[PDB]
Amino acid sequence: NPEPNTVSYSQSSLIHLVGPSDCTLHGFVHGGVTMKLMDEVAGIVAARHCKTNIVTASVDAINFHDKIRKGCVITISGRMTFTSNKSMEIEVLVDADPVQKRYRAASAFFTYVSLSQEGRSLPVPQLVPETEDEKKRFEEGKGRYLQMKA
Amino acid sequence: PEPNTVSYSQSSLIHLVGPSDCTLHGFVHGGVTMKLMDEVAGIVAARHCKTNIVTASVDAINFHDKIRKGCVITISGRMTFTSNKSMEIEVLVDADPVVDSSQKRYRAASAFFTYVSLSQEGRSLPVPQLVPETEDEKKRFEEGKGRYLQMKA
Amino acid sequence: PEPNTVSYSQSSLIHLVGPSDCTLHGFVHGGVTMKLMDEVAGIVAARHCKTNIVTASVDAINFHDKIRKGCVITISGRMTFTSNKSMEIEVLVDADPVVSQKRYRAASAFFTYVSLSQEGRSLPVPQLVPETEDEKKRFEEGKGRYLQMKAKRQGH
Amino acid sequence: PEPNTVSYSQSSLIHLVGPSDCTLHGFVHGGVTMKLMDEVAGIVAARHCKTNIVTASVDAINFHDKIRKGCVITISGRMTFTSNKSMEIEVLVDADPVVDSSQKRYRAASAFFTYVSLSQEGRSLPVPQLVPETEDEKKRFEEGKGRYLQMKAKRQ
Amino acid sequence: PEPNTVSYSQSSLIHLVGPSDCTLHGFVHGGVTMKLMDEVAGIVAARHCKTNIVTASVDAINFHDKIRKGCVITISGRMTFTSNKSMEIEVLVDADPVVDSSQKRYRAASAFFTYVSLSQEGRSLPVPQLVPETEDEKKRFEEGKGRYLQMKAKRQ
Amino acid sequence: PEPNTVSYSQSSLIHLVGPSDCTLHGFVHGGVTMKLMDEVAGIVAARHCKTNIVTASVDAINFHDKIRKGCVITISGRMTFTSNKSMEIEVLVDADPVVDSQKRYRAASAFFTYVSLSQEGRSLPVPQLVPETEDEKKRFEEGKGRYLQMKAKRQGH
């Protein structure tokens, strides 16, 4: 029962220069490194939206569309897509620039939950979509939400 | 332990939750757990393929419970199914507290990783087939084939 | 966006201050901020030169304020001036708490890079062409700082 | 303090040799191996004591063979002997190539760590006794008592 | 070695250039060097203040020469001057090859770091004064005062 | 300072104990200390051999005392003895508190043994260490002692 918010309000991103400690013995980035970055972004989004303690409930469908080489800059951007009563869905996209041309590297839907200081699960501020796509993405989210419950 | 069997690649990892793993409250970031899970899966994949490997997808990462400062978590992984060009690996995370048995060991997270094998040039390679031997290995393999087909759809 | 303009190479980087970035109290080591600044500068240089680049000098690194655990820091760089063989890049670091009160300026510096051939020799550099008011002004101030530095590495 | 068994605390760890683990040639710094060994031993000690622990000594670290880029190394530890206030843990390091070569899994390193248990105030605590069960566990315990006595001497 | 003297806090650091320190060609990123320099400066500051310290500014970082793979670099720092609330530390970086011999130790970089001491609350504290003893210590102190005054002007 | 003498290779390293170095209580993982010690020993070995080097054995790592958050630790190494194909280096770790002062104390120590390798990976003869002072001759002697015993221990009866 707190105050609603918009996707622009919490929209967040993050830009990382693939360094050598990010990489496999060949030239590529461990999926773990990518996944951790994606979690960090989603967590920031969630935090902005709830202004509270948050935890990951589930991540569903992490897709690696392409490899990431040493010396790319990766942009990880997250935005809220749907809220239920007690949970938030956040879409995280990863793109890559070499420094070959900018491409989509990974994606995922994180699901977060808001916790009190005692550790109980809280009602979550509702997401209010405004544009066409925000209503569409919200709808698709409600869809993915229902199936996961099933 | 024969090659191409689950026992051959089965791998696990133990990690003492330290302070740099934690949120401002007592709990471990999902990203930390996820990273450790991918490390094990990749080790499994590498042992099985003896080649370069990359993550293709991770599906259904479930966090069954929080992990607090001073747990030891065990992340273990094992191959479940192979298609022609892809490997599915199941990763499980369990947690022991290390100060008090108010309760004991519990299941904290789980996921199915899917890896792919690459040549030096970077092309996708046929993958050594997994041969199940026990009851559960045949069952898990079957379930794997199931999850594989749906993902294609 | 035309090549050799500042917009062409303008680059930024966003980093979540994590625990390994920090001192035993709550704050980020200057070394960490300095490294991130260099990475951004380097990327700007590389975009503009399309070549191998190295830092020649960094001058005036100023830490305007401390950075906490759990800030996101934006590090942005842009080209300010070019001489014949050298590029000056301005790097700014801003910080947002996620923990909300007010984004602030945390650090700043002028990096000077030099473009290198495959053999490792210092090459003529593509000239920067300013377009807006501020770009001409910043270029002028750059020429200024460039001249003074050359005076600094000699006697009387 | 209730006694316990080797299987209870037995712990192991698997690590893919990455590039930041390596010398300028192909090989892993002893320090990296040493640090992974200490991590496992400490986890073993912790499981057994359920208390704060610190290393008291490590004796006889032997590097039987080099470890190259792209091995997976398994470091495994198990308790071997306990005195009244100290625990001896054996750590073994094995290596599998994950690259394709004619060359099997091999023993890379080994050591005996000695840990001690501390109270919250920081005093040295009596330690849960290790109770061996199999042939080898009694043998390894015996050997441990041997190594323990000599260390007390060589320290006189 | 008396407290508040330069010898008291003088600190150095030795680092083997590894492969994760390097550019795609053979050379060390300036960022790496800069971070190592800040670490040594910080330690010097800490030893002198026995308090929490942060970097206020770094001025004039000069890269005199490239550092390739397989050098050992020595980064050493010492206090040069103190004002009432700030400390100036000089950091010098030297490099030894460990590869082909016909290569003599050389000066690779240098800088003056300026640190400030903070209380737990985060307020700026008066700083213990540096007391020079030798010729050069008085000279370096003087030059410091000089650089300090100019920096106040550049902004005033 | 002549090559192949202990002064030539003597090396040291200073580290500010940070929070990622630390146990959940205030203390530094032995692994962290051990790694720093190996780094120093390796640098000493490298300086003396001007070649590729690897750790053969570390013997008798002693932890004389705990190290907590906000110490600066000095790890210093120096060569003590050489055989024909191996080098012994002594590493000592001291700790200064950097907060309200507990003075400086000895925290750990060890003898590392390194070996020099060619590009092919074969074990090379090693430049001999020439002691000059009293202690350098004494430490060299004690080194020869420790070397002989290790060859025995690792041999049978």
UniProtKB/Swiss-Prot annotation, chain A:
Quaternary organization: Homohexamer.
Entry-annotated residues carrying N6-acetyllysine: 67
Annotated keywords: Acetylation, Cytoplasm, Fatty acid metabolism, Hydrolase, Lipid metabolism, Mitochondrion, Repeat, Serine esterase
GO BP field: acyl-CoA metabolic process; coenzyme A biosynthetic process; fatty acid catabolic process; long-chain fatty-acyl-CoA catabolic process; medium-chain fatty acid biosynthetic process; medium-chain fatty-acyl-CoA catabolic process; palmitic acid biosynthetic process
Cited function: Catalyzes the hydrolysis of acyl-CoAs into free fatty acids and coenzyme A (CoASH), regulating their respective intracellular levels. Preferentially hydrolyzes palmitoyl-CoA, but has a broad specificity acting on other fatty acyl-CoAs with chain-lengths of C8-C18. May play an important physiological function in brain.
Protein name as annotated: Cytosolic acyl coenzyme A thioester hydrolase
Active site per UniProt: 39
Domain HotDog ACOT-type: 8-118
Compositional bias ranges of the Basic and acidic residues kind: 133-143
Tissue-level expression: Isoform 4 is expressed exclusively in brain.
Origin superkingdom: Eukaryota
One of the record's GO cellular component terms: extracellular exosome
MF-aspect GO terms: carboxylic ester hydrolase activity; fatty-acyl-CoA binding; long-chain fatty acyl-CoA binding; long-chain fatty acyl-CoA hydrolase activity; protein homodimerization activity
Positions of region (Disordered): 130-150
From-to range in the entire protein, with total length: 217 to 370 of 380
Domain notes: Both HotDog ACOT-type hydrolase domains are required for efficient activity.
Keyword Acetylation appears in the UniProt entry: yes
